[PDB]
């Protein structure tokens, strides 16, 4: 060969009380089990930690394995989770046409992600997969990439009904995002704790709900019909939201809790202001290049977003086409 390489491939349920240490050029493949419970530290180098229903080493053309379609991961009482490599969690049983009985609960005191953290969850067309997924370290520091994808039992993106609720943060936690979040497929990302830093969040067909009172430094990009929704009272900061428009890739939207009273858009500043009947005004930076006459506003029950909250919804009837702002 020439270089070092370690592969640990470990089948079945695991109750892990020792530290999880993955070296550089090393892969630790926990697979097959229905119950995973970790309670000590994680030190992931420039290698891969994989926890999933199918082995990391299985492929598109692999025969099914006789494991239950059930996947429960708990990380709790862990003091430190440090990821410098790839950390993948996947609940999908290949070629199963039932939803996994699945829960993911990630509650380490500290989670520092310097590499890639990816969660892959199954959706099934015609079914309604709604697994439990809570990512709420007391302290979450993302210097790398946090991907959440909902895929079919063969690995294509799932875009159907049953938006999977993914709780990110909690009322006491602190999240700093300094690089990238990307949520792909039928995901309702519930941002339930404070987020600060300087980062991008890509919503590829997904919905993100800003439910907390601190959401700063985060630029949001709406792709393939993704939507930004805010349920908390207006933020002091003007959130940047790119991609509002209508194309054949979908209709993206921006929505604020309540019922619409009015809106104003300044084509020389890029700021749109949405005012609700209760008198709350939400300000967002959507870019210059929009024609005020082509905005559309509606009230929604929430059902279009698989929410129970009423929303005042802003859309735009032509494609996203940003321009540089000019006062003129
Ligand atoms: Cl749910
Ligand atoms: Na409602």
Author numbering: 17 to 344
Article excerpt on this structure:
Crystals of the Awp3b A-region (Awp3b-A) belong to rhombohedral space group R32 with one molecule per asymmetric unit. Awp3b A-region crystals soaked with Gd(OAc)3 diffracted to a resolution of 2 Å, therefrom derived SAD phases were used to solve a native dataset of 1.55 Å resolution. Only few regions with uninterpretable electron density are contained in the Awp3b-A•Gd3+-complex, namely the loops consisting of residues S75–D82 and S320–E322. However, these regions are clearly defined in the Awp3b-A structure. Interestingly, the T1-loops of β-helix turns 4–6 from Awp3b-A are cross-linked by two disulfide bridges, C115-C145 and C144-C178. Despite the limited sequence identity of 24% to the Awp3b A-region, the Awp3b-A structure closely resembles the Awp1 A-region with an r.m.s.d. of 1.4 Å for 223 Cα-atoms. Crystals used for collection of the native dataset of Awp3b A-region were grown in a sitting drop vapor diffusion setup. A 0.6 μL drop (0.3 μL protein solution + 0.3 μL reservoir) was equilibrated against 50 μL 0.1 M sodium phosphate, 0.1 M potassium phosphate, 0.1 M MES pH 6.5, 2.0 M sodium chloride.
